[PDB]
Design a binder for these strands. Structure first.
Ligand SMILES: [Zn+2]
Ligand SMILES: [Zn+2]
Length: 99
DNA sequence: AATGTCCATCTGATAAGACG
DNA sequence: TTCGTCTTATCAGATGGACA
């Protein structure tokens, strides 16, 4: 919901980010700020091996080398136990950060 | 050849918010 | 209600491939 990059006005991106003052830049635009200390010169031209879902905000790799949904890779790394197919939840839930 | 830049994509930290 | 707990978003940093 509703975020448009503060430099290039992008609307989608592999992964969002923020700068020192906590403004939402797209990936490339932010990975540019951390590194160069400069607004990025615009001019800018699968399923979980565990729960078999095709929807996640972040893909990872199981101990094997295969893509696992978010939820899963976190679960395993934390319980050293494949995440039950019971914890499976519906749709998507979102959250509001802010430093 | 050999290094540097740009950036998706992964692994790691922080912590939101559902729920006991 | 009120407050810990636990799952897992959503941030930050690491790693690597593509191109100059
Ligand atoms: Zn941008
Ligand atoms: Zn999964």
């Amino acid at each position: 919901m509703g975020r448009e990059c503060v430099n290039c006005g992008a609307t989608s991106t592999p992964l969002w980010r923020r700068d020192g003052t906590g403004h939402y830049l797209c990936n490339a635009c932010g990975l540019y700020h951390k590194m160069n200390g400069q607004n990025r010169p615009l001019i800018k031209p699968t399923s979980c091996a565990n729960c078999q879902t095709t929807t996640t905000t972040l893909w990872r790799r199981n101990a094997n080398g295969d893509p696992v949904c978010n939820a899963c890779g976190l679960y395993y790394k934390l319980h050293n136990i494949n995440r039950p197919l019971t914890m499976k939840k519906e749709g998507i839930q979102t959250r509001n950060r802010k430093m």
